[PDB]
Amino acid sequence: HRTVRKIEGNLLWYQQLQHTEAQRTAEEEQQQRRKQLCKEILELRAELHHL
């Protein structure tokens, strides 16, 4: 049961670590979408001010 825990928890650990690296590429797409939304908010606020 001690060997099983060492095997499973190291696998779980490195899976979580790879999931954090794959999250960085999703963070770049999310940052691009956030820049797009902030640009759209600024355009909408400017149109609202003119209205």
């Binding site: 939304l37 759209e40 908010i41 909408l44 609202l48 209205l51």
Partner: protein, 50 residues
Amino acid sequence: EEEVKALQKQKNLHIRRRNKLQMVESGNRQMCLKSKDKEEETGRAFQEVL
């Protein structure tokens, strides 16, 4: 995305309210032009009394 939806809803509200204000203002401007003709008619009736 909620903020964009809120601003879109506010933009649509301001577009509708501005269109309504322009209808009120156009009706009012037509009433005001005719109320100027009325001010000239009542101004003539006032000169008649003088």
